[PDB]
Ligand binder design. Structure first.
Ligand SMILES: [N-]=[N+]=NC[C@H]1O[C@H](O[C@H]2O[C@H](CO)[C@@H](O)[C@H](O)[C@H]2O)[C@H](O)[C@@H](O)[C@@H]1O
Ligand SMILES: [N-]=[N+]=NC[C@H]1O[C@H](O[C@H]2O[C@H](CO)[C@@H](O)[C@H](O)[C@H]2O)[C@H](O)[C@@H](O)[C@@H]1O
Ligand SMILES: [N-]=[N+]=NC[C@H]1O[C@H](O[C@H]2O[C@H](CO)[C@@H](O)[C@H](O)[C@H]2O)[C@H](O)[C@@H](O)[C@@H]1O
Ligand SMILES: [Ca+2]
Ligand SMILES: [Ca+2]
Ligand SMILES: [Ca+2]
Lengths: 547, 547, 547
């Protein structure tokens, strides 16, 4: 089969908050095989499932306690196979997250470790006295944790946790830990899962003096894992994560000369915190510059464009000291979660204003790379920030407006979370049964946009070239495919509230007719004088530029 | 200013979960000034107040981080003074809870007692070493903790935490820790407050080998505190928290010869878990043996009868292993915590019966000693087990059912907890506005019972006699007041679903006419032959036995 | 089953307001066969059915527009045959209504008579030329109608409409209409149902001079119709209804000598408007004296008691000026419709005193008449009284607290009348699904009472002796059975709020042990001296007087 990660849109279907198929007030794998038709109807080809393993849910389940067993709440591991079989016989791809760099303080490998120095599971985790080692590494959570080392009583030594107080980072130097964190990678691929993500890759190895992140030793292990995947089972997308400066530190794609020997796909973290900056700043540079700075990429790796995920809009080092602008713009009513992010969903971030919403949908549907959509955001939900942790972005999705937002058929007290009841973004104001009918509802509009993004095999294997006109508050680009008689396209996105005039310079494509895509309204021929256009506030076009 | 310990009913109104006059999602001390009228309309005279001092609300508010300032959320201390001024004018006495056994793991004292001993606060806490010390007392919370000692990374030593490990018990041997705690009272009593309820008194001074509870020396400091209270600001009702064996230890009153030199009252903990095990077993013995097995009390103190409070429900740690059938009857739900495991409220306990609830309210208002009323039992409220911790019995009060249970005028997602929404026990099925007009509604039955109990001073300062009869499924009293031509009264409470015939033994009162208290419908004159009555399921009468 | 109506309980179920099997917005026969398990689980044994024939729904569906056709929106004759052949499988018998003395002004008969003064249908209706004939009848609908003669301008004459303006009376003097009015009965019986509630019987023949009510010829015609139903289709009952003064005015049974040659039952309108005044007046005279003033009955006919039906309280023509008292106690607000009973349902009539409701259910199931329950009395349901006319007593049922009270899944605008929403009465507070769990719910209490009443063949086929004591405010019965070792039964019912002593003279049953029925709690053996029982306010006992 083809590369299939160049042409695809990913969905973040949290196994929780989607559907309760047994009245347990929580998600369920067998509860997703019954709503695996809303996805196909929506036109989504690859599904992405965050981890669901045996893990006391102290932090969104990223506290694995066993990498060999499905959490009993979310059905057995004989229901994951059913989900895979049902999502393969319908034309959908599912990738399951795999997280390294930690383990909950309950895995036998840790309890039997702190209680048994010199035992086999003795040096798996990082144990070393003193609070001076790696004294230059930054601290991520500037709210809960404040030491990054902590103190373990039973052994009285220290331990190395990079994320929380109950997540001891594994010491990968021990050449036996990198045979039990790789035997998992060689097991789930045996179930037929098509590719698996890698989470928190930059923080694996840490050595003194350096910054402790993205050391030139993680990449050796990544190359080893990629070679293992290639030799054992070909054709899987080892999606990755960077959240680093664009530079050369985000490129985990391997040596360009070979073409690819590492992660097949990254995430556009450098650009995610700048789309909003550009949109509110009424300009296009905060996006054009960021797309220009990033170096080139190999010929067999996509770029993973996206807007929001199950995190809090990580406004970290990725952004320079202009964070003081986004704090004062998107973070009034203090809700700064740590020094990173704003902890708000897409729709609330934009005053629920529809125009900005479809503008951003177009921007993530056209810019270089495949899009990834959070399970909501196609209805206009979110908010409910006041809950503990960053759990204002994991409320159950709001289907039909019956009791408990049609999530399940149990008591409204047994639900693991209460469906929102905001006067605006409530479960009685933004539904799925109240939007699948109206032909201009946001769900249907995004479905249409997806529909017109599959009839041009030029949005996924194309190119990028910013044309630019006199007006600085609007950008344009041409996703032209390669070869003779290219499947050229055009895009002209506004970035201001009002309507503006644009003087494009498409003379390089002279003798071309800009056939529209919304309604096939043949526009004026591409003359030689400055091409002229006039757009409304937050408006956009998707031309075709045919001969 | 009389004793008033006896002629008084107590309301367990939490500062939170009651009202919200600031539109923030939590009870406010300004939320009681404009609501006190309702209490005066229900027939109450003394309004209780659990802890509300400046503290992280990590457990209830007993995790005190300061003993001198009100929590900033609940207004300011001037608001407390205004509450006192506007509640005394109605003749309602306010008494606050007071926790002195411990302060939270954030108090200035604990911090300066950590990381740098040898200072003035070096031994404001019980600092020890090794897990062999005071190794006789049981662990209370046997569901979360496992060791009861804990550690400390900044000093490597151990601290004797008794409850949770974030509010370590103070070391009471110093004549400095207990010379400031007796200043907290010095301050609070200066605002016009009326007494205090000591929290977890038994767990003062401990010594090796003993059980650390009820040690002969705690009473020394108790007598000192009583002398302090009496000498300055005379006439303030104290209380106690004695969850010990019946009368064997619970006896916490001063020398009987000298009248009284300890707690001015007490909470009849040994009785609570029995009012239930008698009604379920269809017999009266368990309510009689343990009401007689208890020794007497000094004739200057009451006996604090209550039926439910904010706890794990029916504390079952001081009753023999034959309270192990209050798991197969009252705890069918597989959710039992803290070695007793019910965590429900009064109404859901009694299978939602309108007869049993009224029977239990009658018993509460009838048995010896002044009663304590829990805030959510004059409506018929329920509970939510699946809320974690004992917070399931602290859901906000369900007033009018319009919006978020009329509790507040803020976002439904902003409240600290979601108002109950069960089909049977919700802010729609049970309300105050929906039960404040229709007679026979519990809010009116209880009001009438209280109004009748405030006109016959024979339940408060009266004697007690168990008439007994041929029927082993009904209990009778005579709450006569000792004296010449006193105010006699009778009570005959059934304990069986089906109707029963009763043959009492009132021959000691020959030639008295039982003028019934409800409507004054006279009865047959008492004759030398046994007096004969019949009752339906779970019924009662309150005869006046006039001359 | 020669009679089957002595050991039977009837349930009035309006075909609308009971369910919705096709999302129409109204009842449905296919929406009733689905629910013939809730009725069969309750214990009902003969369903009831008001009018449903093809007709405009201008007057509660009593404006017949055809006789052989089922209303289009209730299904077809196939659906009715399915209902009859299903309910006849679960030991359930169906009896339908029938209208004889009116026909909406849309029937082909009346449209053909309106014009064409000479013709086959010219004498199927009453017609005159001046409005003086029959000047001694009653204006039943005193509120709207004012003359009782209507003009019909097409013909320029006068017609004599009994009840309402558009309901012209038939003319039974014609020897032809008495043939269609028997063919309709023959056909409807031919479908398979058994029984008929001959309606508006005491108005058929309108003679000159007299009041036009109970004219001697009416009984002759009824004798003819009963003979018709008896000679063919043997074994079919046929009820009746009077709403007249007790005695010969309710002679609608046969000639006592012949056993019976008229209606097989009757509706005890003399007594229904008297239970309420007996209970609210705190006495027993209005019930016992009235049950004694009713003349005897033919030995082979039941008496069919009830408590409330779909009409108003109908307190007129069967009540003296004592009704002037009831208007001042049972309806203080101006909600008295016509010059007859009030438009309120049982529950709201009494307030929510569950004791009163239980007492009324006991009286209904105990007294001589066979019970007739009305849907919505089985639980505590309210009634909206501003809906106009008398439809406020036929609100749609309330099954569950889901959307539109779980009545129907259709859009919440189709429903003819919105489900109630009052704070005390509503579909959120009194739901047949929120009361099927608790074992004290009014629904369960009624089910248990019906279950017990079925085990003693002495509540329906037994005699009736009143006893009387010293208190007027109590009622006593001994429903003995003729013959040796009949299932004797005693009943004591209170009628005063406060508990009462009660001394009865049971000297005729010496040496009889009163075993109670609810729990089998044996009572003291019957005493030659007055038996003494003490009963709580609004209470009752059902002893069995075994040997
Ligand atoms: N905060 N923050 N930041 C972005 C940073 O961290 C993420 O953390 C998420 O994933 C880890 C993986 O276990 C999980 O522990 C956290 O709960 C999630 O918020 C990403 O892992 C990482 O790639 C980002 O750079
Ligand atoms: N669990 N429990 N039990 C009974 C307990 O009652 C008091 O406990 C008070 O203080 C604790 C400490 O936070 C609090 O959790 C309870 O809600 C309070 O009632 C006393 O500690 C003692 O009498 C009993 O052990
Ligand atoms: N009310 N009232 N009325 C008179 C009469 O009512 C019953 O008969 C019918 O009366 C009208 C006309 O159909 C309608 O409102 C009732 O539902 C019908 O049953 C009975 O005959 C009896 O209640 C009264 O005599
Ligand atoms: Ca690491
Ligand atoms: Ca201590
Ligand atoms: Ca007539």
């Amino acid at each position: 089969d083809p590369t299939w990660f160049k042409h695809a849109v990913f969905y973040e279907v949290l196994v929780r908050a989607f559907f309760d198929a047994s009245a347990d007030g929580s998600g369920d794998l067998r509860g997703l095989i019954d709503r695996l038709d809303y996805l196909q109807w929506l036109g989504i080809d690859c599904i992405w499932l965050p981890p669901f393993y045996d893990s006391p849910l102290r932090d969104g389940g990223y506290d694995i306690r066993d990498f060999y067993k499905v959490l009993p709440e979310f059905g057995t591991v004989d229901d994951f196979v059913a989900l895979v079989d049902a999502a393969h016989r319908r034309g959908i791809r599912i990738i399951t997250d795999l997280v390294m760099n930690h383990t909950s303080e309950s895995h036998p490998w840790f309890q039997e470790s702190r209680r048994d120095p010199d035992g086999p599971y003795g040096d798996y985790y990082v144990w070393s006295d003193t609070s001076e080692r790696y004294t230059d590494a930054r601290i991520i959570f500037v709210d809960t944790e404040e030491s990054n080392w902590s103190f373990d009583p039973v052994r009285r030594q220290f331990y190395w946790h990079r994320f929380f107080s109950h997540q001891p980072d594994l010491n990968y130097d021990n050449p036996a830990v990198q045979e039990a964190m790789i035997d998992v990678i060689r097991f789930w691929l045996g179930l037929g899962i098509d590719g698996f993500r890698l989470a928190a890759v930059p923080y694996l190895f840490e050595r003194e003096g350096t910054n402790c992140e993205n050391l030139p030793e993680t990449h050796a292990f990544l190359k080893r894992v990629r070679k293992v995947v290639d030799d054992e089972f070909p054709g899987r997308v080892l999606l990755a994560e960077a959240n680093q400066w664009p530079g050369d530190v985000v490129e985990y794609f391997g040596d360009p000369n070979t073409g690819g020997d590492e992660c097949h796909m990254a995430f556009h973290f450098p650009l995610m915190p700048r789309i909003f900056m550009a949109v509110r700043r009424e300009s296009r540079f905060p996006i054009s510059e960021i797309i220009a700075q990033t170096p080139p990429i190999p010929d067999m790796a996509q770029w993973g464009i996206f807007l929001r995920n199950h995190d809090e809009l990580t406004l970290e080092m990725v952004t320079d000291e202009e964070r003081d602008y986004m704090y004062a713009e998107y973070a009034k009513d203090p809700r700064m979660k740590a020094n990173v992010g704003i902890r708000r969903r897409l729709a609330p971030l934009l005053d629920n204003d529809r125009n900005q919403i479809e503008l951003f949908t177009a921007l993530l549907l056209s810019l270089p790379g495949s899009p990834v959509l959070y399970y909501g955001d196609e209805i206009g939900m979110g908010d409910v920030i006041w809950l503990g942790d960053r759990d204002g972005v994991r409320i159950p999705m709001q289907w039909t407006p019956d009791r408990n937002a049609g999530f399940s058929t149990a008591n409204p007290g047994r639900l693991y979370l209460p469906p929102s009841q905001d006067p605006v973004y409530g479960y009685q104001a933004v539904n799925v049964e109240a939007q699948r009918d109206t032909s201009t509802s946001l769900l249907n509009f995004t479905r249409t946009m997806l529909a017109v993004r599959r009839r041009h095999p030029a949005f996924a294997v194309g190119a990028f070239q910013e044309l630019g006109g006199s007006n600085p508050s609007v950008l344009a680009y041409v996703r032209q495919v390669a070869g003779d008689d290219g499947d050229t396209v055009l895009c002209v996105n506004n970035l201001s509230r009002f309507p503006q005039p644009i003087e494009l310079d498409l003379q390089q494509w002279t003798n071309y007719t800009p056939v529209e895509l919304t309604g096939h309204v043949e526009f004026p021929r591409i003359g030689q004088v400055p091409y002229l256009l006039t757009l409304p506030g937050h408006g956009f076009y998707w031309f075709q530029l045919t001969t």
